[PDB]
């Protein structure tokens, strides 16, 4: 399902809830139209890979989570597994999410 992380504290809890399941994190800015506009593929895929947990993160309302990763640009997607970061990339490319998920699935 989809989980919105409004704080780094919840980010740690969500990583633990995913367990060994893949975990994608979107740092898109909700205030940025181009970034939020690309969320349908990220959010829509949640049911495409229900065996994968998708997290949505606001660099503005969830800046504590983004500051931890030192995000230098949005939208940025980060992959976590067992609470371990194994991949990250930037650029408004929704299809790229499909390949990276396939890569870490």
């Amino acid at each position: 399902m989809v989980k919105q992380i409004e704080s780094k504290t919840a980010f740690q809890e969500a990583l633990d809830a995913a367990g060994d399941k893949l975990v994608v994190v979107d740092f898109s800015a909700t205030w940025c139209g181009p970034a939020k506009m690309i969320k349908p593929f990220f959010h829509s895929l949640s049911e495409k890979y229900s065996n994968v947990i998708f997290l949505e993160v606001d660099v503005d309302d969830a800046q504590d989570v983004a500051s931890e990763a030192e995000v230098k640009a949005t939208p940025t997607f980060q992959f976590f597994k067992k609470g371990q970061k194994v991949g990250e990339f930037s650029g408004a490319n929704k299809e790229k999410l499909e390949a990276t998920i396939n890569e870490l699935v």
């Binding site: 940025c32 949005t74 930037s90 408004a92």
Partner: peptide
């Protein structure tokens, strides 16, 4: 220097 595909943090928000 500004790419529509990317949002810059230089933004006050």
């Amino acid at each position: 220097p500004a790419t529509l595909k990317i949002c810059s943090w230089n933004v006050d928000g």
